[PDB]
Each structure stands twice: as C-alpha cells, then as structure tokens.
Amino acid sequence: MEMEKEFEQIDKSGSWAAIYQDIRHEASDFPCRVAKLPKNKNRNRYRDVSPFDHSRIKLHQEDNDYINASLIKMEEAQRSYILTQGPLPNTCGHFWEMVWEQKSRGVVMLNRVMEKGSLKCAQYWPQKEEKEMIFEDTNLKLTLISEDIKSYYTVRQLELENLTTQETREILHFHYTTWPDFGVGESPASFLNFLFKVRESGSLSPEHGPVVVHCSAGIGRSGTFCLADTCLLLMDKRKDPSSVDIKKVLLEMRKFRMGLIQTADQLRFSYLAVIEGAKFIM
C-alpha cells in the first residue's frame, strides 16, 4: 500500500545500501559470553555469528548446555522462532536434542548441504528410510518416513525417537532447495509459496514449540524467512496494516539474534516478499 510506494522511493533513490547500513549501526549489541567460551569453540560454525546470552537456547542434559541457537520471541506478532546455524558434524545430536526439548514440530532449512562446492551444513537427517541416524551422545534416533519432493522445496516426514523413553514424534522437515545461487530471487513468489506451505502445515502454531529455522549461519536467509513471516502477521493483525515498518520489525528481531539479514539485497527481497505476500492474503 504505502509500503509499496516507500519501496519504489528507495529503489529510485538507490538507498538500499544506506538503509541496510543504518540497521547494522542501530542494531542491539548484547553479550555472547557463553558462545565465546573456549570449550564452545567447536560448536560454532562461524566465529563472527554467536547467540546472545539472554536469548540462547540451553540444552538440558548434564555436561555442556551450549548450542548456537537463539529464541526470537515476537511479542506483538505472537510468534516465536528458533534460529540456529546449520549443524556441524559434532552438533547434530545437540540439534535434535534441542528440537526434542523445545517441542518443535517443524524444521525449516533454507540452504543446501553444499553450495558453490563448500560444506554449509552437516547431513543431519537420514536420506534413506533403511539407514536411520542414531545420535549416541544425546540418545536420539531419527528415521526418514517419507518425503515429498517438489520443484522448489521438499517436505520430509521424520520420526524422532527419544531412545531413553522410547517416545516418538513426527517432525516435518521443510527444505527450501532453490534459494538463488548468488544474490536473491528476481521474484518472491517461490519463497512466499514455501512460507505458506510451512504455515498450512501447522508447524508454526502456538500449540507447538517454536519452529527451528536455519540456513548456514542462521541469520541471513533465516532472517529473511522470519522477517517476512512476522511482517505479514503484523499486516493482517493491525487495523492500520500499513503502519508496519519493516526496518523497525527487523531491529526488534535483532534484539534476539545478531546479524539478521546479511545484505542490502536480502533487505530489498524481504520488502518485495512482504509487499507481494500482503497482496496475496489481500
């Protein structure tokens, strides 16, 4: 609406880089003391991407509670997300332990395991039904039950079993497999359709623990996904639906995890997605 004209003004004035750098400058700065402890060095994929102490997810088993993951609690929009890095070969057990302990129903993956020939995320789920994964450190078993592969994303039904209690849970794995190789997409259509499929699944509902969202570092594409989702919620909730200020929402989110949205293009793409998505919900 008005937001759509604000978008055009930024585009003609070429102000995207300027707006994005204002966000980085105004962003919250809270301590990440635990993330930076010597014993956690090999639980961080990127030394420059750490959870704040105040919002980090704590693992419940006995020896080291640390995982590189943040609870993002959007109060007005009434939605919570856990944003986390793509797990490492040694933190896959921690990752599924977090999913169990936080009672998550869905996992949203926004990257491929390898991109431009670099390892961005461990193969943390089973690719074959008959080859289940056992995480001996956290005593969990994970089985591929079935998968629905579409052109722009794949949804997998996973069975997560607490080998301690033999309780099992169905986890939905929403894998957006087609984020553009460089930059962002020309159109937000495919990303928006993926978002709506996650919503339709029930994985985001408050009856469940927060959805777990990750990319490689858990801040760039992950930030895009949560920012768009939250802004679209706010546009549907408010009686003044164009009072939604995307920059303000992003700064609110950045109180809970650093660095959400990593490029001016991703900020532009987020605006595009919220604009076109708000029209879809109409």
Ligand X SMILES: O=C(O)C(=O)Nc1sc2c(c1C(=O)O)CCNC2
- Residues annotated as catalytic are 215
Question: Which token pair is 251?
Answer: 């700064």
Name the binder of 147 from ligand X, Cl ion, none, CB < 5-8 A by kind: none
Residue number, 46 or 280, with CB nearest to ligand X: 46
Span of 36-44, 70-78, 82-90, 127-135 interacting with Cl ion by CB under 5 A: 36-44
Contact mark string toward Cl ion, 100..129, x via CB under 5 A: ------------xx----------------
259 binds Cl ion (CB under 5 A): yes
Q: What stretches of the chain adopt beta strand conformation (E)?
A: 56-58, 66-74, 79-84, 106-109, 114-115, 118-119, 133-135, 140-149, 153-162, 168-176, 211-214
Torsion-angle region of residue 272: left (phi > 0), alpha (psi -120 to 50) or beta? alpha
Which residues ranging from 147 to 166 are in contact with Cl ion (CB under 5 A)? none
| CA–CA dist 224, 152 (Å, integer) | 17
Count, residues in the chain? 282
Q: Is 46 in the site for ligand X (CB under 6 A)?
A: yes
Applying CB under 6 A, among 44, 80, 262, 270 the residue interacting with ligand X is 262
Which residue in this structure is represented by tokens 């708000």?
Answer: 278
User: Which residue type sits at 232?
Assistant: L
- Is 220 annotated to bind a ligand? Reply is yes
End-to-end CA distance of the chain: 11
- Say which DSSP state 17 is in: H
- 121 or 244: whose CB is closer to ligand X? 121
What is the footprint of ligand X within residues 200-259 (CB under 6 A)?
215-217, 219-221
Residues that bind Cl ion (CB under 5 A): 24, 37-39, 112-113, 199, 245, 248, 259
Residue set of the binding site:
181, 215-221, 262
Residue set of the binding site for substrate:
181, 215-221, 262
